[PDB]
Amino acid sequence: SYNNIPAGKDAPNDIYVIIEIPANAAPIKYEIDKDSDALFVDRFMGTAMFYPANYGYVPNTLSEDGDPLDVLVVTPYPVAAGSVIRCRPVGKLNMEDDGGIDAKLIAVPHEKLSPLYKDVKEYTDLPQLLINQVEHFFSHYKDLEPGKWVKISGWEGADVAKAEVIKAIEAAK
Amino acid sequence: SYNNIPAGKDAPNDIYVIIEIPANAAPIKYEIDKDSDALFVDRFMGTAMFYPANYGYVPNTLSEDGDPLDVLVVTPYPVAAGSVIRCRPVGKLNMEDDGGIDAKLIAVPHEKLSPLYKDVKEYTDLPQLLINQVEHFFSHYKDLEPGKWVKISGWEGADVAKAEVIKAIEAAK
Amino acid sequence: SYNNIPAGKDAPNDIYVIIEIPANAAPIKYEIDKDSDALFVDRFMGTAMFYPANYGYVPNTLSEDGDPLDVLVVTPYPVAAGSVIRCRPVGKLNMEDDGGIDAKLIAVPHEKLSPLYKDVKEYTDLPQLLINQVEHFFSHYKDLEPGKWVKISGWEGADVAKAEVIKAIEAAK
Amino acid sequence: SYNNIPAGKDAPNDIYVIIEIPANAAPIKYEIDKDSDALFVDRFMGTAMFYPANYGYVPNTLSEDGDPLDVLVVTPYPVAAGSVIRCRPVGKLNMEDDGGIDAKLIAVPHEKLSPLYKDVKEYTDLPQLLINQVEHFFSHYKDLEPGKWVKISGWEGADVAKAEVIKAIEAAK
Amino acid sequence: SYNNIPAGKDAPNDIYVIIEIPANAAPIKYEIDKDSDALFVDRFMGTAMFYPANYGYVPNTLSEDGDPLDVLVVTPYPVAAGSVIRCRPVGKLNMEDDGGIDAKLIAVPHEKLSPLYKDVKEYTDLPQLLINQVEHFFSHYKDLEPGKWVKISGWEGADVAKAEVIKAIEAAK
Amino acid sequence: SYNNIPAGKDAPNDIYVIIEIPANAAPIKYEIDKDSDALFVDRFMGTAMFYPANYGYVPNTLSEDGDPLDVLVVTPYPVAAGSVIRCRPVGKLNMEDDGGIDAKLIAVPHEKLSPLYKDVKEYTDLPQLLINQVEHFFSHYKDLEPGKWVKISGWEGADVAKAEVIKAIEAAK
Ligand SMILES: [Mg+2]
Ligand SMILES: [Mg+2]
Ligand SMILES: [Mg+2]
Ligand SMILES: [Mg+2]
Ligand SMILES: [Mg+2]
Ligand SMILES: [Mg+2]
Ligand SMILES: [Mg+2]
Ligand SMILES: [Mg+2]
Ligand SMILES: [Mg+2]
Ligand SMILES: [Mg+2]
Ligand SMILES: [Mg+2]
Ligand SMILES: [Mg+2]
Ligand SMILES: [Mg+2]
Ligand SMILES: [Mg+2]
Ligand SMILES: [Mg+2]
Ligand SMILES: [Mg+2]
Ligand SMILES: [Mg+2]
Ligand SMILES: [Mg+2]
């Protein structure tokens, strides 16, 4: 089971993320079911948009909304829905939506998976266009869903992101 | 496990379908294995055809052939093999094949997944070309497999389709 | 050459559209070069969005921005960049950008190409979600290019769309 | 222009084919317009089928239906619509539709393009399932367009295929 | 679980292979996790190459490196990562890498899945180009990974391949 | 026609490149025919490799092999075969094959097309893994075509790349 995946091999610097939606995919919003470990279609998205990075969660974590910690993972090629990426957090995008405070971490693959990100220490080391694409996507992807809305607060750095990982791992027990 | 997925949140009007073959996919006929929950390649299809809608089954049901209830689900984008769609049945295509009586339900996504189908109450509310494509596909997709054949009987409406859902759920126990 | 293609077989009710950007495609804004007839990359789009319908122009027409008349064509499957679709206008989206006023027609394939659009005579006969997606796309796709803005004025019907074809055809003479 | 391309470097044994519809593609029936050289959408195909091989024509030939000679080209990977393949005929599928008699050649890439077809000298040297798929495709792909019918007469060998090339080349003079 | 899949319905002539990497896929090297049954991204491959055949392993086997028996499966269309193919071994490619002796079997689908391979009894019955592509891929796919290397020994036939299947099945207990 | 396209808007710093083979594409080596302007299949590549960047040529240039100047263009998304990209050279890969000496430029999109390459002025400003992939690709892609060989001499900077553009432009006069 996915529950047999640890939150990471090494604390917050070295974590696992289970991908629910590949980057640059069809506008199908998948979510993994806790009981099933199965990929559920939560909705077909209203707007003509795609996730700018792979979107998933850290197994064995618990966030404020009761669900695992949300993470976007940047990769050189989109990964398969349901697959698991060893990665490293570099930032945190603060938002609020219809459901309350909702933050998304952003992460890059571990050095064992690729050398492309060795010099990416903070989200500000990612391309500025990609950061703006992530802000813009979350500001607008729910625009055509009645009863859903998003407000962007701002970004925080890698240390805060790792802080949220530790909090969510302990909240899981 | 897939067996931890109920046949639906609400009886026959609101059901879950596990997708084995996405719409418009490569001509690979996948089937989910009961013991494994794993996707098995049952065959590479002989004819140069594709499923006109996503093809799967309702978990926790039992049909006449001993297997779960077959369902085709219409969606705006093909969904991933192995994913689970909350949907609503609108019709039933009656057929017989080498194995005996074989009916396929047809369904559209629940209102929470998309607004595109709110006015689709009966299979006759779907495009006539799509209905004819479904009849034509099942009449011919086995034409190049020795020892396999299909005869189409005809279509029945949404109430009959929901009737078959209830029958298969009770047969599962 | 593309200039050999008339605006239509029959006036404004039966027109041809040369596609530049397929529906549901990667975020590459191609434009056909008037002289070479070759497909140029105008830009990689800044936002994580995709054209909700195929986008192109009517040959041998002239609009106010000095270019042929813009048209979105709804199709059951996205069509190749550079290919030509016989279609019929059903609506017009009014808007203006920084460059001035700018409208896009919306159209559907001629009945010889597909039976699926027989009952679509006005843009309001298309799914409401699609109309909303087209409007949302043009409102936001340029949000990440500095200085660019688009305000939506609203939709107009098929008669108005055909009027704009008549006008743009004569402007090309 | 496409008219600058000869029927072949060497007669009927070494020909060129301009591809209109790639193998394994979406069900869009493209046809190249004689005048503009542009790829037109002739129709969206009614049935849930795909061309089992790349489909196109030999430039500077003339058949009985007043159009260049039709040829299917088997390739290890589907080739782009509008591209040109140096190939060699190995068979001919005889049939007639409502429009009259109609035959398609089948061909394989010249040995300069791939070594994979060295031992394919007759269509019977291709996998039997492919030959059956081509026959099944042309028997059924038009089943959902009213009034259209196709009856298969049978296959003929490479010598007959080369005879039809010789003939169609002279008809174009 | 994948562990509920037998090594095959019938010994070494009729085996199951769980696919980790589809043929002709993105250069993402997936591996199934023993504890999770989940697909892990082991790395993004350095070189600009793709697996020439589907790559997976036989469930319920144990090889020298402690892992299940590696198998490449040739199919007419790439199969989904995580899916299971009933197949039949036809050869064995001997190699050594940074980790020690590493052999890969090669297999074709069982007759129930496709008729395309009935006459393929030995790996030498596969196209010579495909055999050379497999040798070339494994000789070079690690060229841009520091600390990884591969040396090709040579090929062995179907009987040796089935011999390795039996050895690995018994080693699993 | 493609001949109407100048080598660039501005000399060697601002050039156009006509793409023949998109990045990350199937292993089909297309070449544009000088006369017909049509995309020909030159060969199906023997090795299981793909071009790591889009590959094409500068119009209205002449190299030593009697063909226009070869250029690889790095883009955020692969671009369609036959399309034209406004770009800027940043490096040159020196090598020779059996045919003689042969160099490829590497280039990035003009800032009007994308902001992502502002700080890329020399090829050493691209990810090191990409530079290594390009070198590895050209060293090995022809390994399975008998008699063909390529030896890499090394990379040179942007000034040298622009020198080769100046030279090839005058050779075309
Ligand atoms: Mg989440
Ligand atoms: Mg959340
Ligand atoms: Mg949210
Ligand atoms: Mg079934
Ligand atoms: Mg059944
Ligand atoms: Mg059946
Ligand atoms: Mg325009
Ligand atoms: Mg315009
Ligand atoms: Mg505009
Ligand atoms: Mg034809
Ligand atoms: Mg014809
Ligand atoms: Mg015909
Ligand atoms: Mg392995
Ligand atoms: Mg191994
Ligand atoms: Mg190894
Ligand atoms: Mg070249
Ligand atoms: Mg060259
Ligand atoms: Mg060369």
Numbering used by the authors:
A (entry chain A), B (entry chain A), C (entry chain F), D (entry chain F), E (entry chain A), F (entry chain F): 1 to 173
The authors write:
Here, we solved four crystal structures of a family I type PPase from a strain of the pathogen Acinetobacter baumannii. Family I PPases are hexamers formed by two stacks of trimers.
Structure 2 was solved from a crystal produced in the presence of Mg2+ and PPi. In this structure, three Mg2+ ions (M1, M2, and M3) and one PPi are bound to the catalytic center. With this information, we set up the crystallization conditions to contain PPi and Mg2+ at a ratio of 5:1. This allowed us to then co-crystal AbPPase with PPi. By carefully analyzing Structure 2, we found that the electron density of eight AbPPase catalytic centers is different. Interestingly, electron density maps of the catalytic centers are different. This indicates that PPi in the AbPPase catalytic center can fluctuate and interact with different amino acid residues, Mg2+ and water molecules.
